[PDB]
Amino acid sequence: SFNFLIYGKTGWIGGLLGKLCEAQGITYTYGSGRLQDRQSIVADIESVKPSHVFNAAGVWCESHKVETIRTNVAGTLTLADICREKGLVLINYATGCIFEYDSGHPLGSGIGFKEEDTPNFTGSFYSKTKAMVEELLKNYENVCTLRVRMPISSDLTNPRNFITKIARYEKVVDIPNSMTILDELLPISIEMAKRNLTGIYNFTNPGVVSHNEILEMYRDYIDPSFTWKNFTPRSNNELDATKLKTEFPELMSIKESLIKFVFEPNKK
Amino acid sequence: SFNFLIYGKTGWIGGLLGKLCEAQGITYTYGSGRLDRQSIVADIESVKPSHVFNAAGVTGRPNVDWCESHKVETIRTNVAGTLTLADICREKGLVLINYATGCIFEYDSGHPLGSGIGFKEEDTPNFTGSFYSKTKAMVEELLKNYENVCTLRVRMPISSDLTNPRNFITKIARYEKVVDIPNSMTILDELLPISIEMAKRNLTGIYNFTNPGVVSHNEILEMYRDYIDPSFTWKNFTEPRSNNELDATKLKTEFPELMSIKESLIKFVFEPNK
Ligand SMILES: [Cl-]
Ligand SMILES: [Cl-]
Ligand SMILES: [Zn+2]
Ligand SMILES: [Zn+2]
Ligand SMILES: [Zn+2]
Ligand SMILES: [Zn+2]
Ligand SMILES: [Zn+2]
Ligand SMILES: [Zn+2]
């Protein structure tokens, strides 16, 4: 009944999805093909005959911008199109870092950006390009787009993990941010496929956390001797968790979720 | 020396291009490939072109309903296909002449109606409420990253062929009332040859690609009347389409012989149709 075609095997979310699909006992296969060409994708689909498809491909000179366009724009739009022609729900792993605190959603307010909102942080190429694709993907009834931010998981060896970035910085800033606890949200995303959810979902845990709060948990739970300094353009914001929370009332707030899925199992 | 790969034989400009290459003795070929990399990659190796022309659409105001199937259809060809084509050309060192739209700008506080102040290449599209408009702006902004691509902003394209329903003149001449707004416009008969020359000169970046100056719908209809049908009649509105002027400085500097709409209209469109 359930059969998953997944793109991005050499990737963080891609790999974790594979391991998730073992322990869940779900049939899955990693897309051999390349997003850059439609021929590949059509083949994979017709060969694998998937019920759902997952896109975890992806996450500035010309060469690297062009490369990103080829995979994040052309490629993502092509997969979306094919999956639509075929009737397949496409889970599209994307970014929430296209918003930033502003006059209508001020730092410290509790008012988060909603799914329906216009991306207000689009100066950087990556940010703009990500906003462009998200806007375009709205016209694809089958696509479900997930706004992931500053992904964190239970494994601190991962240089991509946000906690291990912050515990490395010389000085750090202290700004509350919406973040994605992978261990919790990734099983949730799989459930979203099963329920055939589509549209945009902010895909962070509800509530916000700052670097100081995360470094405090880090010192207490995993290195009691740890020390950091504070400062006496990146994205900072809250995403509104309402829509994702309505569909998934078991979803945990960040601190509470950092404690269970990340810090308690790494205690030392 | 020259060998052109052209996309869009189906369409207005793409058809016109082919005829110009015939008339000028330039070897050209229309691409079989659907804008499917491998399909395009095949064309480039089969044709071994010196330059590539993307007229894959759409010539002018298009043009149907904006439902999902229709929006998606433009995204597949005008976004993913155009970006795929630009990519392959860039990898291969090939210059790509991309025919596109100027109808992504609108009269504003800093470029007011009647001011003679026109939008520049560098300017940020300010008319992007509608899907088509936002989408073409997106692609245009993205194409800025492909140094081999030459984006041309064509507005309300016009031909000496007054029988062609795509021609802006015959649209307006066939309508009951009309809006009368000064606009920048493109005389294909004059401007299409120039685009062949831009390719020859390996030009790149964005060019506003309308004739210098503006005409209103009325100034045009009056010329229709005195040149083709003196018995012609029309009323106005007393009561959203893109209305703007496009700065022609950059195109004129590169092409001094470029004429303004009115004189270009007279010479290319109306006089050889008396
Ligand atoms: Cl708002
Ligand atoms: Cl400006
Ligand atoms: Zn680089
Ligand atoms: Zn980020
Ligand atoms: Zn809001
Ligand atoms: Zn137009
Ligand atoms: Zn200006
Ligand atoms: Zn280069």
Curated annotation (Swiss-Prot), chain B:
Higher taxonomy: Eukaryota, Viridiplantae, Streptophyta, Embryophyta, Tracheophyta
Pathway entry: Carbohydrate biosynthesis; dTDP-L-rhamnose biosynthesis
GO cellular component terms given for this protein: plasma membrane; plasmodesma
TM annotation in the entry: none
Keywords noted in UniProt: Cell wall biogenesis/degradation, Isomerase, NADP, Oxidoreductase
Molecular-function GO term, any one: UDP-4-keto-6-deoxy-glucose-3,5-epimerase activity
Protein name: Bifunctional dTDP-4-dehydrorhamnose 3,5-epimerase/dTDP-4-dehydrorhamnose reductase
Function: Bifunctional enzyme involved in dTDP-beta-L-rhamnose biosynthesis. Catalyzes the epimerization of the C3' and C5'positions of dTDP-6-deoxy-4-keto-alpha-D-glucose to form dTDP-4-keto-beta-L-rhamnose and its reduction to yield dTDP-beta-L-rhamnose. Can form UDP-beta-L-rhamnose from UDP-6-deoxy-4-keto-alpha-D-glucose, but cannot convert GDP-4-dehydro-6-deoxy-D-mannose to GDP-fucose.
Organism of provenance: Arabidopsis thaliana (Mouse-ear cress)
SUPFAM superfamilies assigned to the protein according to its UniProt record, in alphabetical order: NAD(P)-binding Rossmann-fold domains
Binding residue positions for NADPH: W12, I13, G57, V58, T59, Y99
pH-activity dependence text: Optimum pH is 5.5-7.5.
Coiled-coil regions, chain positions: none
Gene name of this polypeptide: NRS/ER
Catalytic activity, as annotated: dTDP-4-dehydro-6-deoxy-alpha-D-glucose = dTDP-4-dehydro-beta-L-rhamnose; dTDP-beta-L-rhamnose + NADP(+) = dTDP-4-dehydro-beta-L-rhamnose + NADPH + H(+)
Expression across tissues: Expressed in roots, leaves, stems and flowers.
Enzyme Commission code(s) on record: 1.1.1.133, 5.1.3.13
